[PDB]
Design an enzyme around this catalytic site. Structure first.
Site, PDB file in Angstrom:
ATOM      1  N   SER A  67       0.790  -1.223   0.000  1.00 29.75           N
ATOM      2  CA  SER A  67       0.000   0.000   0.000  1.00 29.75           C
ATOM      3  C   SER A  67       0.828   1.282   0.000  1.00 29.75           C
ATOM      4  CB  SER A  67      -0.949   0.022   1.204  1.00 29.75           C
ATOM      5  OG  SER A  67      -1.991  -0.922   1.041  1.00 29.75           O
ATOM      6  N   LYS A 124       0.112   3.598  -2.830  1.00 33.02           N
ATOM      7  CA  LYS A 124      -1.053   4.473  -2.898  1.00 33.02           C
ATOM      8  C   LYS A 124      -0.655   5.939  -2.896  1.00 33.02           C
ATOM      9  CE  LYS A 124      -4.055   0.934  -1.020  1.00 33.02           C
ATOM     10  NZ  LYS A 124      -4.334   0.063   0.154  1.00 33.02           N
ATOM     11  N   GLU A 141      -5.486  -3.632  -6.895  1.00 33.80           N
ATOM     12  CA  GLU A 141      -5.771  -4.278  -5.622  1.00 33.80           C
ATOM     13  C   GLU A 141      -6.748  -5.429  -5.839  1.00 33.80           C
ATOM     14  OE1 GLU A 141      -4.224  -3.738  -3.031  1.00 33.80           O
ATOM     15  OE2 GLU A 141      -3.511  -1.658  -3.034  1.00 33.80           O
TER      16      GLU A 141
HETATM   17  B1  LIG Z   1      -2.016  -2.076   1.917  1.00 32.11           B
HETATM   18  O1  LIG Z   1      -0.848  -2.745   2.001  1.00 32.11           O
HETATM   19  O2  LIG Z   1      -2.437  -1.591   3.291  1.00 32.11           O
HETATM   20  C1  LIG Z   1      -3.509  -2.426   3.661  1.00 32.11           C
HETATM   21  C2  LIG Z   1      -4.007  -3.045   2.464  1.00 32.11           C
HETATM   22  C3  LIG Z   1      -4.372  -4.572   2.758  1.00 32.11           C
HETATM   23  O3  LIG Z   1      -4.679  -5.214   1.551  1.00 32.11           O
HETATM   24  O4  LIG Z   1      -3.051  -2.965   1.484  1.00 32.11           O
END
Ligand SMILES: *[B@@]1([O])O[C][C]([C][O])O1
Length: 261
Positions: free
Chosen positions: A43, A46, A139
């Site tokens: 994540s 992001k 995702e």
């Molecule tokens: B990122 O890594 O932070 C939480 C989510 C869980 O799939 O992705």
């Protein structure tokens, strides 16, 4: 150096593979541990998707207010905020905040779609000079964190430099940069990671990441009271596919870095 010996010892004690990059913006000095090895971003990617959308909003001035429908089919495995708006809408600003501050995976997928796919996120990285970042999947599969798999990876050095440019530099417009910083400072998922290894008086904006192979990541901008800010990236991954998260390793790495200042 002492710091690199302590980071190596921490890594040895942890059973996994640790990547660290610190940029001290005071003298532009860098501290690197496995700084040029690839790690699964999970994540932490992001941040790049949110920043790419912010870059779009410099020309499309109303873009962040654009409503985006959340449909049941959009929901994936971890959607703390999007779940609250199924069959309704969220603006691109609300999706960016959800992706960053709650690590919402549905929000991330909507940001990827806005950018025309993972290649559109990677394209933004290239546009700001990051030749290392690669986003290949959406995702939730970008979190598989398979050893040796180059998909959805970057290096600590590359991510530190890019996070510096996005938050402290001028890769983004002034209003966009401030918005990103505000979002990162308001992260809700980072209390046990880098933040936990640092003085309580320091201000931190961070984005965590977790995935398979016990992958436990955190990237942060740090504003010490009365001192130039720091950029710290900590990546950690483990040899067992079902390994447990180790946020304590990231806190410990942050503490070791902070001691050496
Ligand atoms: B990122 O890594 O932070 C939480 C989510 C869980 O799939 O992705």
């Amino acid at each position: 150096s002492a710091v690199q010996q302590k980071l190596a010892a921490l890594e040895k004690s942890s059973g996994g593979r640790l990547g660290v990059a610190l940029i001290d913006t005071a003298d532009n000095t860098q501290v690197l541990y496995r700084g040029d090895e690839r790690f699964p971003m999970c994540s932490t990617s992001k941040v790049m998707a949110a920043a790419a959308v912010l870059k779009q909003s410099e020309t499309q001035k109303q873009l962040l207010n654009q409503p985006v429908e959340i449909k049941p089919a959009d929901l994936v495995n971890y959607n703390p905020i999007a779940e609250k708006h199924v069959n309704g809408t969220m603006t691109l600003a609300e999706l960016s905040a959800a992706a960053l501050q709650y690590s919402d995976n549905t929000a991330m997928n909507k940001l990827i779609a806005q950018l025309g796919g993972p290649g559109g996120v990677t394209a933004f990285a290239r546009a700001i000079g990051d030749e290392t970042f690669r986003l290949d999947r959406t995702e939730p599969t970008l979190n598989t964190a398979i050893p040796g798999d180059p998909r959805d990876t970057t290096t600590p050095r590359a991510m530190a430099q890019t996070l510096r440019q996005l938050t402290l530099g001028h890769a983004l417009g002034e209003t966009q940069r401030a918005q990103l910083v505000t979002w990162l400072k308001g992260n809700t998922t980072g209390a046990a990671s880098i933040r936990a290894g640092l003085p309580t008086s320091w201000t931190v904006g961070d984005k965590t990441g977790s995935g398979d192979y016990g992958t436990t990541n955190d990237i942060a901008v740090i504003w010490p009271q009365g001192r130039a800010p720091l950029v710290l990236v900590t990546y950690f991954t483990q040899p067992q596919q079902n390994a447990e998260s180790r946020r304590d390793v990231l806190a410990s790495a942050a503490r070791i870095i902070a001691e050496g200042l």
